[PDB]
Amino acid sequence: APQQINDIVHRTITPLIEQQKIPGMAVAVIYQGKPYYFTWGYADIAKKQPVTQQTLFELGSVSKTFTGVLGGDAIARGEIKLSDPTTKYWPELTAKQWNGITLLHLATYTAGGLPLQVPDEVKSSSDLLRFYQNWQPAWAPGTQRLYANSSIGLFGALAVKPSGLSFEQAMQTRVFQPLKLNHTWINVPPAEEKNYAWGYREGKAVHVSPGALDAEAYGVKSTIEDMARWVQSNLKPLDINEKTLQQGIQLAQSRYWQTGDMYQGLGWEMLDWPVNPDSIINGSDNLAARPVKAITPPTPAVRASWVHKTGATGGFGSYVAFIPEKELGIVMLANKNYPNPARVDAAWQILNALQ
């Protein structure tokens, strides 16, 4: 527990929790490949349960990094190809607007305007089919990026079809188990309920509600220890023994499209390191439609990158960022959804000091 790490973390996070009124928080800093943990406050205010290294937090969109990597693993296994048309894995999707929309477009939010959220009205398989069949794109595929759960959520669901495994089974067997993420879940089991923190929205305790493609877009819950391990795995994929998983991690950090100074990966988003903090901080502020330049062909994962992902739910706020070249990373999990810029700012202050 180097004093430098202790000091920068505490000096940065304490003020943050005070200003944002965060009930509880966990932070992990990966320095030279090793993890250091920090916790504050409560996982359950009413029951006075403190946040610990075993507390589970809802990751929200950070879940998309798991989906991107699982998809990458499927490509490495030769089960799917990002160049495959969406209809190859969903024959029922016969509507003409789908011609030319590939799994790559789904995975990177470039299908042409798929909506941010799948309608809360969608509550069945036929309902989901109708939703996608009736969706009218605003742009041709591969021209504009519009962040969307309905886009990467569908990618995740189709990517696992060849395996015959459910999305949860595939995630558990192909990603969580190999990486020893034994306290990371799509559905929190009863055995872990005691560790599942409550999220707080306007002072009320809340957990994420069920929704279509929730598993694929925002369904993961994890501990600060497992997320530290997730960061280490993504920082140094060559240390991973499962060949297709190592390759899937590499594919998820490849640069497929560029918008401004950001590059879109599978789930992960990247910028060249060194980065202009104002670029990532103001850049993380909440989702617009932005034209994209295709990187043809995609650039394999660049070590000198600031790789990150912000995530939230009604009652949680999370952020992950790492720099492969420096063997440095950070994970910030909180049970209150606070402004993205504040998370990025604190994360940059910490990593910049340690770099």
Could you list the residues that contact ligand STC (CB under 6 A)? 60-61, 116, 149, 208, 217-218, 310-314
Phi, psi of 42 (to 5 degrees): -110, 140
198 DSSP assignment: P
Spatial distance between the Cα atoms of 147 and 180, rounded to a whole number of angstroms: 30
For the CB of residue 219, give the shortest distance to ligand STC in the complex, in Å.
9
Q: Which residues neighbour 207 within 8 Å (Cβ) at sequence distance 6 or greater? A: 58, 196, 198, 199, 315
Of 210, 60, 88, 80, the closest CA to residue 149 belongs to: 60
Nearer to ligand STC, 107 or 312 (CB): 312
Nearer to ligand STC, 61 or 254 (CB): 61
Q: Which residues neighbour 227 within 8 Å (Cβ) at sequence distance 6 or greater? A: 28, 59, 62, 184, 320, 331, 333
CA count, 13 A, side-chain hemisphere, 89? 23
For the CB of residue 136, give the shortest distance to ligand STC in the complex, in Å.
21
Distance of CA 29 to the CA centre of its chain: 18
Nearer to ligand STC, 217 or 280 (CB): 217
Under 8 Å between Cβ of 314 and 199: yes
For the CB of residue 305, give the shortest distance to ligand STC in the complex, in Å.
21
In 10 A of CB 129, how many CB atoms? 14
Beta bridge partners of 222: 57, 184
For the CB of residue 295, give the shortest distance to ligand STC in the complex, in Å.
24
For residue 147, say whether it is annotated as part of any ligand binding site. yes
Nearer to ligand STC, 129 or 206 (CB): 206
> Annotated catalytic, 318?
no
Which residues have a catalytic role annotated? 61
Question: Which residues define the annotated binding site for a beta-lactam?
Answer: 61, 117, 147, 149, 312, 337
